[PDB]
Amino acid sequence: SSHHHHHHSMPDNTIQWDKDADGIVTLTMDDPSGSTNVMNEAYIESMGKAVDRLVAEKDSITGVVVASAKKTFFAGGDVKTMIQARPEDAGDVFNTVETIKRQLRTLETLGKPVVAAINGAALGGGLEIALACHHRIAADVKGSQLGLPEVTLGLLPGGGGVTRTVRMFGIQNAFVSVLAQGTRFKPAKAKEIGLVDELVATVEELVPAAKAWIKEELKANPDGAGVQPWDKKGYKMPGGTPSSPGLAAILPSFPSNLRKQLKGAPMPAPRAILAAAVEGAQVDFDTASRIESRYFASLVTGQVAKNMMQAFFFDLQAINAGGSRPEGIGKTPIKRIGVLGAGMMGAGIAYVSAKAGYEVVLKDVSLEAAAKGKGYSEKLEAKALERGRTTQERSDALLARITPTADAADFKGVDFVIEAVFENQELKHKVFGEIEDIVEPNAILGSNTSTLPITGLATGVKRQEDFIGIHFFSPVDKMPLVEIIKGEKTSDEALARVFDYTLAIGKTPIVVNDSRGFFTSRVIGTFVNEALAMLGEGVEPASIEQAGSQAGYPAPPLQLSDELNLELMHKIAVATRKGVEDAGGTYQPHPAEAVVEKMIELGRSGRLKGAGFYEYADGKRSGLWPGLRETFKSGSSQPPLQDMIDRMLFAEALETQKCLDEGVLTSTADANIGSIMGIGFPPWTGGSAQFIVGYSGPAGTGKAAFVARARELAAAYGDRFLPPESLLS
Amino acid sequence: MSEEAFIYEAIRTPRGKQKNGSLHEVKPLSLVVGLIDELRKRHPDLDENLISDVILGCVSPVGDQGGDIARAAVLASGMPVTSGGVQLNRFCASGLEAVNTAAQKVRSGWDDLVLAGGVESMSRVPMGSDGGAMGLDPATNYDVMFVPQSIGADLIATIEGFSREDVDAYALRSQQKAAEAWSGGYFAKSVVPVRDQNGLLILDHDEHMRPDTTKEGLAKLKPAFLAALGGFDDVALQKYHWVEKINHVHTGGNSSGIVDGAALVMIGSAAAGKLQGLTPRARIVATATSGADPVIMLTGPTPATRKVLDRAGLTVDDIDLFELNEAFASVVLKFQKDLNIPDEKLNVNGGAIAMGHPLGATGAMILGTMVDELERRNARRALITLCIGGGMGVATIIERV
Amino acid sequence: SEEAFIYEAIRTPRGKQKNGSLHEVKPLSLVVGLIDELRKRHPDLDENLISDVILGCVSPVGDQGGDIARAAVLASGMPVTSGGVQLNRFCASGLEAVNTAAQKVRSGWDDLVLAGGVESMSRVPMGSDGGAMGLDPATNYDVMFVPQSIGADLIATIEGFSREDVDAYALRSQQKAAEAWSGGYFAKSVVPVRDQNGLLILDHDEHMRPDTTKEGLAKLKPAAALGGFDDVALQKYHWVEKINHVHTGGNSSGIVDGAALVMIGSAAAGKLQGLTPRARIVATATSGADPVIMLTGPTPATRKVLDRAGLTVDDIDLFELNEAFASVVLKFQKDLNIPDEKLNVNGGAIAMGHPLGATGAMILGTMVDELERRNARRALITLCIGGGMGVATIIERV
């Protein structure tokens, strides 16, 4: 019943109170402990007091404005506290969000208009406060975003977000457009879908406009002033309630549609949101709100939310704060980028550099080749133009930033080189050799390489200090990671410059030490290798693919293998064998290598050659090659699906731990985000390193459970699953 | 397990079609009362006070079918007030479940004479009208992988290797045999024409039937379009991970028809019938309830039939007539394949593809169909079974007396 | 041939209609909670031997639609072979479920059967499912449809039960329910309802008013039954000039949410699973009486079940009749001359509530416990029903 956490026998105040001559109260949110207003213990007590005072002084209050004194409006909840919540803390988590909502419910049922003046970003808890208002005005300013992104942290909008958006938009629209994916909206878009009611050009207009809106509403709508649509007698939910025949006919398909979208991956937040939405819609507002709290508490105390908070809050923060960027290094602005190679990688790299605003010279061996490379950007711009995401003027400037050439001399004035030619050391030496004297003397000499050690590539240039691995992922326009690889000779200044470039193009960096396969390529290798091994053992291809998707990978492993190219996989294995055999050791081949060699022998080395595990026709993937079952005796081995899933996930987790032990990776943050963004490791795990400490299975949770399951897989499938000494006690 | 249970009467309405159907103007309650009045006509001197219960299957007991339609029938027909009235729902098996339950009540010794059957006016109260605990609950629906019946049926065909031509060949056969049964006068005494308040004819035949169906006509039809709504194919293959692609072979022409109808069966002990001067037509030998995977949904008939055969101490060879509801062509072909049922013994008078599947009533209709055919052939034993939503199965053995 | 034994009988607490603790809980969850409790009682029980799940439910629509019994089988992870059927015989549905389960067990064609009921009246109000007796004019006109509270007032008028008479019974029900609770009678059988996080939702019968007084009961206004129904009733009961309206919310059953589950099987089926029999189902009977008065079905059903078991009132230690309305109980008592100390000894629906489809299974379980507690031999359980039906069951302690 209380607006407060405690009711027995000391946090800071975050809300400024101001009451006008007209009786309008401005609540200006301004947490002294940070530059952002966050839904924390300080906020809860401050808003509790404020709401108590609103009730106590109600005879002299005519309206309320909810404002902020920060650059943003209000963003996020207390993640630090929520990440610590154990199953036994379910009561306290429940009570916390129940208290939060009791405050907003009072605000909302005051009998007076409440207006949110949204000066900047209103995200999660921030938007939830705004949704408790009767009217929302946003300043149409740059960088301003509105949305409920808590699903991206493995949470749900537990401060009324689910309940209110469903009441506003109905089940289907709230779920699909707002809740399921935690979509962020620009103010213009926010207005369009009804998340915001009005826009103003500047922040200074907000409060006066809010007060003017209160004035007009009291004059024109006295009976309905401060009454949300759902608190009115004749309220009808848009799209209907679950008991209405129209929705009832499509409702049972909502969970199946969701399961289709998620491919059977064990990510509990979206299903919890859908359950809260539908169950909420069946009952009155207050009951709906309480159900919401129970589903929230369920996610919070679960393991997946801890994985996701760790990666997508803490790890991302650490990376974006320059955690892997060397300390005492300044800035060096980039004037002219030169890309070598106009294939998918080079064309994609040119696009993202040009979209960022950089001039790009795109060089290939012929003008025809380089021009078709720019055509890649043209097709992306044409598709964005039809979707209405950019203007003709803006698009033309983007494309005009890309100059296709066949002449080496056109790399004159280039201060940042990104090479993306064929995986061959002597070719890369030769292509850099043709260019190293033509470019600016201070130019970064970057290489997009999948496996070849950067130190070995560096010998082909004079200024090895400026040579570095700049590893992108296909397709470049969609893949958010850049793996930055430090060669033995690479200077710290060179690392920082590539770090800064990565941020400038809107991508996420990790810094890796030189080692063949680096982090991403080496670890993704273990995933596809397990899949191929299973095929060799006689496991149904269809099951292997299902296992991949149900594990949470964005693409199934045999499909991915075709894209990686089996000839590349072969020479990767050939390289590892050479290292061992030259050192006098005996090489132990992965059981996948025999399956790779078999497919090469059959003339089915992947998509590029026209045939792999899948059939290809007219430039489109058709289906699984029917001869696959006879070739590998498919059906003869039928292990549990969970074993197939675990073999793939575990191989990568173990390999990530090896990378950490060897000093390839320098932080778990880089391991987690690197695996998620670079090689498509499933988001629910929180990353390949988090998977170890946050593992959850039938036989328990945590590092000890991971070790037990790893040992379980090792006995059944081979010694490669035995954990490193670093994981043992 | 004491008193033996006997079938004394088994009657049904004709089945009215879903679109511009003759029975659309007829309340489901009227369909039941009509059958009660036919039984009254056939046995004018029966002491109705000896009827202790009326048990009706009904899958969508809402609106016209809500409020315990069995009790409504008891009171509306002017049956004695002591004659009970209970509605039950075990999806597609409801009609046979009502009969099994009636038989089991007689066997217990605590009921003497029971009316059992079912009613479904699908044109007035469509499937799914009652909501559904599973569907209104995303948390439930998500966990227990809910998949509509037709997809499971398609999946059966995919796994077993039943082609589009195979399932259509069964459909043609059903139409042929229904037409032959009707032409032969097999249904003359058991199908009771529906009439209005003035005695005027409303329907006297199974109007969903298409007796002039051809192989080519069936080949021209489109696959079923809960269907067309996406997700369910992907969900089905998440459980059945070894299957790459579901072959969609089922159409409106090889699946059961949506129809209106009711069926009534009189069940009692030997003494109860003897006291009322009733002639027993068959004995209920054994019943069984079993089940299978709820995602494939429709493979429940096989374990239920095996369990009822074992319980009665019989084998496939001992049964003269097999009657399995024709919800989907592949379900029947799968059942036939699993148990090596001879073609000449299976759904011999046609089935739901031809005549329709009025959910709650169907079990009792096909039971009555078998009582009549046993007598007509002068054969001994029939097994009656239906596939059920949720993966359930029900089966019954009857012996001609 | 086989005898039917009760091995377990449990129930939820009953959640009240207005601002009730169970309003946020789906009826499916109520049943699954009880299945989970049975599983906790017998973790080694071979669930493959459970051949059916039979649930009473009077409004099988929305949350309670689509064979909720099957939904419970699947949602609880019970074997796919374990059945699931919903039934509706109005107020008797819960007991009908138990009786049907017993009859299936006796028939020899079912081994072990779960039976009970569920009704979430705050989420799915009665009448939600529609019906012909109420909604179809031609047949409504002919069956003389009259809401049950009028039949109850009519009984009071004919029998001469005054407002103070019905209120006195109501007070006694509150007292006896309070005493049963405080005495720990319900500690084992009432299973607290908890959320997905293990947090308590409800652990007691919320509808109870233990501080009820005769003076407070006298303040209440008589008790939809608004528009024409009095005259319809008096058209049949032509010798009574005026109906004395004595029933209120204080002397009638409470509208509540709840579920109940009972495990029933043969001696062999229980022996095979190491279960101890608590009681034996002696006999069952269904009967009826005038549908206009509606609520006099218990008498002939009790008469029939007693004769069937070869017993008399004097052979029965406890009588348990659902307290739909105070007059119905007083009428039943008068007819059969039931001693006061034998009747509804742990309170009833007036105090604790009447969650339609579950009630029969709840009060059956109540008697299994009370016979065990008293070390008494026989209980008779009965309920009045819509349309003038009546069901009765005799259990014997083992």
Side-chain angles (χ1 to χ4, degrees), chain A residues 1-8 10-141 143-232 234-619 621-729, chain B residues 2-224 226-401, chain C residues 1-187 189-398:
Chain A
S1 56
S2 170
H3 290 132
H4 302 259
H5 184 331
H6 314 275
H7 59 276
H8 294 116
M10 41 190 178
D12 289 328
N13 181 229
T14 70
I15 299 182
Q16 298 182 243
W17 229 86
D18 177 82
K19 192 208 272 173
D20 263 350
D22 295 313
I24 297 174
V25 175
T26 304
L27 304 178
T28 310
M29 301 176 293
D30 192 9
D31 189 333
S33 72
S35 60
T36 302
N37 293 315
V38 66
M39 199 167 261
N40 54 17
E41 221 56 53
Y43 159 80
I44 292 162
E45 178 62 26
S46 304
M47 186 65 88
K49 289 170 186 164
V51 168
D52 287 350
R53 192 174 167 173
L54 289 175
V55 174
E57 292 179 21
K58 74 157 159 190
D59 288 351
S60 64
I61 299 166
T62 59
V64 188
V65 177
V66 178
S68 167
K70 308 289 191 200
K71 290 184 187 190
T72 58
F73 181 71
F74 199 108
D78 200 344
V79 172
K80 294 177 287 158
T81 301
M82 288 308 164
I83 207 169
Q84 299 187 73
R86 303 154 294 160
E88 67 178 300
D89 304 321
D92 298 326
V93 176
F94 174 77
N95 292 348
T96 301
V97 289
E98 286 284 283
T99 303
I100 287 162
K101 281 181 287 203
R102 204 172 299 120
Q103 295 172 356
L104 298 176
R105 189 54 175 155
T106 298
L107 185 69
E108 183 179 69
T109 59
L110 230 44
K112 329 168 181 299
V114 182
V115 185
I118 311 170
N119 56 301
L123 296 165
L127 186 58
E128 288 176 306
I129 290 161
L131 296 175
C133 303
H134 307 97
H135 194 75
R136 280 154 298 279
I137 309 169
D140 191 2
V141 65
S144 181
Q145 281 173 324
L146 296 98
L148 301 171
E150 40 272 81
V151 66
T152 70
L153 299 179
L155 306 175
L156 65 75
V162 173
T163 309
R164 288 187 171 90
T165 55
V166 170
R167 237 67 176 189
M168 293 165 76
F169 311 124
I171 295 158
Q172 190 161 26
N173 285 333
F175 186 74
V176 173
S177 305
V178 179
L179 303 161
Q181 301 197 260
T183 316
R184 302 113 70 204
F185 301 94
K186 291 185 203 293
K189 271 225 92 297
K191 185 197 174 175
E192 202 168 309
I193 60 155
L195 226 32
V196 155
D197 304 302
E198 273 164 27
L199 302 172
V200 290
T202 55
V203 292
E204 298 85 19
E205 289 171 72
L206 280 164
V207 175
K211 292 186 181 184
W213 192 91
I214 290 161
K215 175 113 158 187
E216 182 58 42
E217 172 81 353
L218 287 178
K219 195 186 181 185
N221 196 36
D223 292 324
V227 188
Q228 305 277 38
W230 54 88
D231 289 324
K232 273 174 191 181
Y235 169 71
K236 274 110 82 172
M237 183 167 293
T241 57
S243 63
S244 65
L247 177 68
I250 62 173
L251 186 72
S253 78
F254 291 172
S256 70
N257 272 305
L258 180 64
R259 203 161 199 181
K260 179 193 209 277
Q261 299 290 76
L262 301 178
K263 293 162 184 178
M267 201 164 80
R271 90 161 117 301
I273 296 168
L274 183 61
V278 172
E279 290 179 31
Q282 290 178 288
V283 286
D284 67 280
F285 192 90
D286 292 341
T287 305
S289 182
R290 186 166 61 256
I291 292 162
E292 189 198 85
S293 295
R294 303 192 188 279
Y295 279 104
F296 182 85
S298 183
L299 296 181
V300 169
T301 60
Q303 189 54 235
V304 168
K306 299 188 192 299
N307 300 338
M308 306 212 217
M309 283 184 276
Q310 187 55 48
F312 300 100
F313 191 88
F314 294 102
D315 291 345
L316 256 188
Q317 254 72 309
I319 287 172
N320 291 136
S324 298
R325 191 194 192 270
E327 281 297 322
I329 317 293
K331 299 273 180 67
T332 313
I334 297 152
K335 307 281 98 172
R336 188 172 296 162
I337 292 162
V339 179
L340 291 159
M344 76 187 334
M345 296 309 291
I349 288 158
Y351 181 72
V352 298
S353 305
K355 195 184 164 83
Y358 293 105
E359 290 283 335
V360 182
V361 178
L362 180 60
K363 195 211 171 293
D364 208 311
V365 296
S366 68
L367 184 56
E368 180 189 348
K372 288 189 277 200
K374 187 175 163 165
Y376 183 88
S377 292
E378 284 174 294
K379 260 150 265 180
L380 289 176
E381 285 304 284
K383 208 137 88 275
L385 228 44
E386 182 62 43
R387 286 272 272 260
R389 285 166 181 171
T390 189
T391 68
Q392 189 70 49
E393 184 195 59
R394 211 160 192 88
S395 176
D396 284 348
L398 188 156
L399 300 172
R401 286 183 209 115
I402 310 166
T403 305
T405 188
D407 192 20
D410 279 332
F411 263 41
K412 196 155 178 278
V414 166
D415 58 3
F416 203 89
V417 179
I418 306 162
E419 163 275 304
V421 298
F422 187 65
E423 270 292 281
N424 183 277
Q425 169 156 270
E426 83 158 301
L427 174 77
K428 288 175 193 290
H429 281 163
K430 175 248 212 162
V431 172
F432 274 108
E434 285 174 17
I435 223 80
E436 60 164 336
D437 305 314
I438 296 169
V439 295
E440 302 269 68
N442 201 48
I444 291 299
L445 304 172
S447 174
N448 185 58
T449 305
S450 66
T451 40
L452 307 172
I454 302 306
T455 304
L457 299 180
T459 63
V461 299
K462 297 165 183 177
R463 276 168 282 263
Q464 300 195 50
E465 321 96 31
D466 292 325
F467 202 92
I468 191 162
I470 312 178
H471 187 205
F472 290 81
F473 303 89
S474 186
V476 180
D477 53 289
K478 263 105 169 78
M479 297 293 284
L481 196 81
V482 174
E483 180 173 46
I484 307 171
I485 311 140
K486 189 170 100 76
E488 286 174 12
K489 284 269 213 290
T490 306
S491 73
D492 284 335
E493 192 192 24
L495 274 314
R497 288 167 72 185
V498 178
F499 196 96
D500 297 345
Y501 162 81
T502 307
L503 291 177
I505 64 164
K507 290 202 188 297
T508 309
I510 61 158
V511 177
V512 151
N513 291 312
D514 197 36
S515 180
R516 65 165 54 247
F518 319 116
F519 167 49
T520 59
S521 300
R522 173 179 178 176
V523 172
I524 206 168
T526 65
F527 157 54
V528 290
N529 286 346
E530 275 311 302
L532 270 58
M534 296 181 211
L535 193 78
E537 291 154 9
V539 181
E540 290 278 16
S543 290
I544 295 168
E545 296 303 72
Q546 274 292 338
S549 301
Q550 292 184 45
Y553 296 109
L558 301 177
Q559 171 183 320
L560 181 64
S561 294
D562 283 358
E563 299 282 359
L564 293 172
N565 193 258
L566 282 76
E567 285 175 324
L568 184 52
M569 292 175 76
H570 177 67
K571 51 187 164 177
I572 284 163
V574 169
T576 315
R577 191 181 210 98
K578 191 196 174 65
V580 176
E581 291 183 356
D582 284 355
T586 300
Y587 183 67
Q588 312 296 334
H590 198 288
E593 291 170 45
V595 180
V596 176
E597 286 179 61
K598 180 68 183 170
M599 292 294 283
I600 310 280
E601 176 207 289
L602 295 177
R604 301 195 69 97
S605 58
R607 182 168 195 156
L608 232 44
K609 291 257 209 166
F613 300 106
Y614 286 83
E615 300 200 301
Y616 298 93
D618 314 312
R621 188 188 65 254
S622 185
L624 284 166
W625 176 55
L628 215 50
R629 291 190 73 254
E630 212 280 326
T631 307
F632 296 103
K633 290 200 72 212
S634 305
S636 62
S637 174
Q638 300 177 15
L641 188 73
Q642 196 56 52
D643 278 23
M644 306 183 203
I645 288 166
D646 287 343
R647 280 174 60 180
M648 296 177 284
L649 294 173
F650 273 75
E652 294 194 286
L654 292 168
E655 199 66 17
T656 298
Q657 187 59 54
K658 287 183 187 170
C659 286
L660 281 162
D661 290 350
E662 292 167 25
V664 173
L665 293 155
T666 57
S667 70
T668 58
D670 278 11
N672 288 334
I673 294 299
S675 72
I676 291 169
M677 289 184 171
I679 58 166
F681 204 72
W684 68 264
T685 69
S688 286
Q690 174 63 20
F691 184 82
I692 292 144
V693 293
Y695 173 74
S696 192
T701 297
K703 193 204 280 174
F706 173 96
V707 166
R709 180 62 175 152
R711 275 164 172 166
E712 215 172 62
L713 295 171
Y717 304 112
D719 290 332
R720 72 190 174 279
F721 285 109
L722 286 173
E725 288 297 332
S726 55
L727 295 183
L728 306 169
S729 297
Chain B
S2 193
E3 282 272 47
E4 288 296 328
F6 298 96
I7 298 165
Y8 288 104
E9 290 291 333
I11 59 167
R12 67 184 183 275
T13 64
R15 284 161 261 188
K17 62 191 187 187
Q18 182 197 29
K19 284 160 160 56
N20 299 325
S22 304
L23 301 185
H24 186 59
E25 68 169 296
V26 185
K27 290 171 287 183
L29 177 61
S30 305
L31 297 175
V32 185
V33 169
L35 299 177
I36 285 168
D37 286 335
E38 179 60 28
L39 297 174
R40 235 167 217 156
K41 179 177 171 163
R42 277 139 103 119
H43 303 282
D45 303 326
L46 190 142
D47 186 9
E48 296 178 22
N49 293 293
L50 266 296
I51 298 170
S52 56
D53 216 358
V54 174
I55 312 177
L56 295 185
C58 188
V59 181
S60 304
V62 180
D64 285 348
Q65 295 180 167
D68 187 1
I69 191 159
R71 183 54 174 187
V74 164
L75 294 184
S77 67
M79 277 179 74
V81 79
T82 62
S83 283
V86 58
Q87 166 271 325
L88 71 80
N89 172 29
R90 200 202 289 278
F91 303 125
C92 300
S94 293
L96 191 54
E97 184 53 47
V99 169
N100 290 357
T101 297
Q104 285 164 305
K105 292 174 115 72
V106 169
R107 281 183 70 89
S108 77
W110 301 331
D111 284 283
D112 301 304
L113 199 54
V114 179
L115 307 184
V119 56
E120 207 82 47
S121 179
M122 301 185 75
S123 84
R124 296 177 65 94
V125 187
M127 203 286 157
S129 282
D130 62 312
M134 287 172 267
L136 274 79
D137 196 11
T140 289
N141 196 296
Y142 203 101
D143 291 338
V144 296
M145 324 179 70
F146 177 85
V147 163
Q149 304 193 334
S150 69
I151 282 144
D154 287 330
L155 189 55
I156 289 162
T158 304
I159 297 163
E160 301 298 326
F162 301 137
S163 71
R164 169 66 181 263
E165 282 186 356
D166 293 328
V167 289
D168 284 342
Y170 182 83
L172 169 75
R173 167 249 222 253
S174 177
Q175 300 281 2
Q176 286 170 335
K177 292 183 184 304
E180 282 166 1
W182 267 103
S183 307
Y186 299 10
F187 300 153
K189 73 273 136 289
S190 278
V191 172
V192 180
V194 177
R195 297 187 176 278
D196 76 356
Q197 202 184 17
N198 310 300
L200 302 176
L201 176 68
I202 295 170
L203 186 63
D204 66 11
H205 66 286
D206 297 319
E207 55 173 19
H208 182 68
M209 277 169 60
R210 300 176 60 84
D212 295 321
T213 302
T214 59
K215 270 169 154 56
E216 297 83 33
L218 291 166
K220 285 176 72 185
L221 297 174
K222 284 181 179 177
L226 281 305
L229 282 74
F232 302 117
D233 268 48
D234 295 52
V235 169
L237 295 175
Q238 280 174 27
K239 185 162 204 165
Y240 290 86
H241 51 83
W242 57 90
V243 183
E244 197 198 340
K245 166 85 141 55
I246 298 173
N247 187 17
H248 292 287
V249 297
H250 292 277
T251 72
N254 59 35
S255 302
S256 71
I258 308 299
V259 297
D260 296 343
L264 261 191
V265 185
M266 197 167 214
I267 294 147
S269 65
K274 169 199 67 198
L275 190 64
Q276 302 304 316
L278 304 176
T279 304
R281 311 224 283 130
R283 188 175 61 88
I284 316 277
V285 182
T287 69
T289 306
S290 196
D293 172 56
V295 179
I296 208 162
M297 193 164 274
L298 311 171
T299 54
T302 294
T305 293
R306 268 168 182 155
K307 206 173 97 155
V308 77
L309 281 163
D310 192 62
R311 190 167 279 153
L314 306 166
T315 58
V316 169
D317 287 312
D318 300 303
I319 308 296
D320 303 299
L321 297 167
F322 286 88
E323 182 81 11
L324 164 69
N325 189 41
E326 304 180 342
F328 298 91
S330 66
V331 179
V332 185
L333 301 169
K334 159 79 163 168
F335 179 83
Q336 178 179 229
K337 185 188 169 183
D338 281 352
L339 296 168
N340 199 21
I341 311 293
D343 247 338
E344 333 83 52
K345 289 186 172 188
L346 187 60
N347 297 328
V348 299
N349 288 349
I353 290 169
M355 295 168 295
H357 170 31
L359 307 180
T362 302
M365 287 188 175
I366 64 177
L367 177 86
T369 301
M370 285 301 93
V371 178
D372 290 332
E373 190 61 7
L374 282 176
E375 278 189 8
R376 198 195 66 82
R377 280 171 183 242
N378 198 48
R380 190 60 68 183
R381 291 179 186 84
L383 191 146
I384 305 92
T385 183
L386 312 88
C387 58
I388 318 160
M392 319 176 62
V394 171
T396 304
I397 297 173
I398 59 164
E399 183 179 5
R400 188 186 57 82
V401 181
Chain C
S1 176
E2 309 273 52
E3 296 290 346
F5 294 95
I6 296 161
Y7 292 97
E8 293 287 349
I10 54 164
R11 63 180 183 277
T12 62
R14 279 160 267 193
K16 60 182 171 164
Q17 181 190 27
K18 256 84 162 164
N19 289 352
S21 294
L22 298 184
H23 185 60
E24 64 169 303
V25 182
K26 320 212 98 180
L28 179 59
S29 307
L30 293 173
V31 184
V32 170
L34 298 179
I35 291 165
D36 284 331
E37 173 65 14
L38 292 184
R39 233 171 222 157
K40 189 190 169 194
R41 319 268 261 238
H42 309 283
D44 210 61
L45 196 288
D46 189 1
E47 294 177 31
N48 297 300
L49 268 299
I50 304 176
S51 59
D52 216 345
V53 172
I54 307 175
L55 293 185
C57 188
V58 175
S59 304
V61 297
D63 277 349
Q64 305 187 150
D67 189 355
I68 196 165
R70 183 53 174 184
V73 171
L74 300 181
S76 68
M78 277 176 71
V80 291
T81 55
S82 283
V85 54
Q86 170 270 323
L87 67 74
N88 169 35
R89 202 205 282 284
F90 301 129
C91 302
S93 296
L95 189 53
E96 185 55 55
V98 166
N99 291 359
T100 300
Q103 290 147 7
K104 288 160 113 69
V105 164
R106 280 175 68 90
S107 86
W109 300 336
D110 279 288
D111 290 323
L112 196 61
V113 179
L114 258 55
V118 61
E119 206 78 45
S120 180
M121 293 176 78
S122 76
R123 300 177 64 87
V124 190
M126 68 156 281
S128 278
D129 60 316
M133 283 187 285
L135 300 171
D136 173 49
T139 60
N140 180 300
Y141 202 91
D142 296 343
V143 304
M144 320 208 202
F145 179 83
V146 166
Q148 49 209 4
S149 69
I150 282 159
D153 288 332
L154 184 69
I155 289 163
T157 309
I158 294 165
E159 301 302 333
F161 303 140
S162 65
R163 170 64 180 270
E164 285 184 356
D165 294 342
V166 291
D167 282 349
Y169 180 84
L171 173 63
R172 161 254 177 72
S173 177
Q174 297 283 6
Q175 291 168 332
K176 292 188 176 311
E179 283 162 1
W181 266 103
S182 306
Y185 299 8
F186 298 157
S189 291
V190 176
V191 188
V193 182
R194 294 183 178 277
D195 74 358
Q196 49 270 49
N197 305 303
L199 299 177
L200 178 63
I201 293 169
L202 185 62
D203 70 11
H204 66 283
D205 298 324
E206 279 190 320
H207 184 63
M208 277 168 61
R209 302 178 67 92
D211 295 334
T212 295
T213 60
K214 54 173 184 184
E215 317 99 70
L217 287 168
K219 290 183 189 294
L220 308 179
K221 298 182 181 187
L226 288 82
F229 293 112
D230 262 26
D231 292 19
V232 175
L234 293 183
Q235 275 167 25
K236 203 208 169 64
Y237 291 86
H238 51 82
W239 57 94
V240 40
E241 186 180 1
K242 195 170 175 288
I243 292 170
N244 183 13
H245 292 294
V246 300
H247 294 90
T248 67
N251 58 29
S252 309
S253 72
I255 294 170
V256 298
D257 302 338
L261 265 191
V262 184
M263 210 188 319
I264 293 159
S266 61
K271 184 171 183 281
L272 197 66
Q273 303 297 318
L275 305 172
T276 307
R278 300 189 68 200
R280 187 178 65 91
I281 311 284
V282 176
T284 74
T286 71
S287 195
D290 172 50
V292 183
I293 203 157
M294 192 173 281
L295 271 25
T296 57
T299 295
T302 292
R303 216 95 85 169
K304 195 182 181 192
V305 77
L306 281 174
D307 279 331
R308 178 160 289 155
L311 302 167
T312 62
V313 163
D314 183 70
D315 301 312
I316 306 296
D317 296 285
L318 301 167
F319 285 89
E320 179 76 22
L321 167 66
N322 192 41
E323 303 178 344
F325 298 91
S327 68
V328 178
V329 182
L330 295 170
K331 162 76 166 163
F332 180 79
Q333 174 177 44
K334 191 188 194 176
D335 291 343
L336 295 162
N337 192 22
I338 310 295
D340 226 57
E341 72 272 8
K342 286 205 166 101
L343 185 60
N344 294 329
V345 298
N346 290 352
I350 288 167
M352 293 169 291
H354 175 23
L356 305 180
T359 307
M362 289 186 175
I363 61 172
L364 182 281
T366 297
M367 287 300 92
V368 174
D369 294 327
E370 189 60 4
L371 287 177
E372 204 165 65
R373 197 191 63 80
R374 292 186 175 213
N375 200 51
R377 185 57 67 196
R378 285 181 199 97
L380 191 149
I381 305 91
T382 181
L383 299 94
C384 59
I385 317 166
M389 292 180 286
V391 77
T393 301
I394 296 167
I395 62 168
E396 182 169 27
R397 184 186 57 84
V398 176

